[PDB]
Amino acid sequence: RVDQTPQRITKETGESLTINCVVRDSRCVLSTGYWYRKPPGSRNEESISDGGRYVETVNRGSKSFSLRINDLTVKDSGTYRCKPESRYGSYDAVCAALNDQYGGGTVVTVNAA
């Protein structure tokens, strides 16, 4: 299972937010994780990358990974999902399937300045 928290959150312009994902009840080894955002009113998600305002943290031992976004603006509103990547999926078809398992999402609204 991939447990994503929080489920929904509102923030003010200029605040930071953190989203967490943990892989529970799995034999797989976490290598890394990826993040995506769908803007409000769209179906289509696109990737986010570590760098600048975006700070990613991976904890292999706890099988968790997290995204912090600093200096939020209304442009950061949307629904975010995480996606884990297993370390040894090439050897284990169950863990290869982990690479396609997304968190349940976080619906984020950032209030105007």
Site string for Cl ion, 58-87 (x = CB under 5 A): ----------------------------xx
Q: Bridge-partner residues for 22, per DSSP? A: 3, 64
**The dihedral of CA 36, 105, 4, 13: what is its sign?**
positive
Question: Nearest to Cl ion by Cβ — which residue?
Answer: 88
Stretch of 42-50, 51-59, 76-84, 93-101 contacting Cl ion, by CB under 5 A: 93-101
What is the distance, to the nearest Å, from the Cα of residue 100 to the centroid of all Cα atoms in its chain? 13
Write the binding mask 18 to 47 for Cl ion: x where contact by CB under 5 A, - elsewhere.
----------xx------------------
Q: Which of 57, 71, 88, 94 binds Cl ion (CB under 5 A)?
A: 88
User: Which CB, 22 or 108, lies closer to Cl ion?
Assistant: 22
Strand 30-38's sheet: what is its strand order? Answer: 8-12, 106-111, 78-86, 30-38, 46-48
DSSP tag of 29: P
Residues lying near Cl ion in the complex (CB under 5 A) are found at: 28-29, 86-88, 95
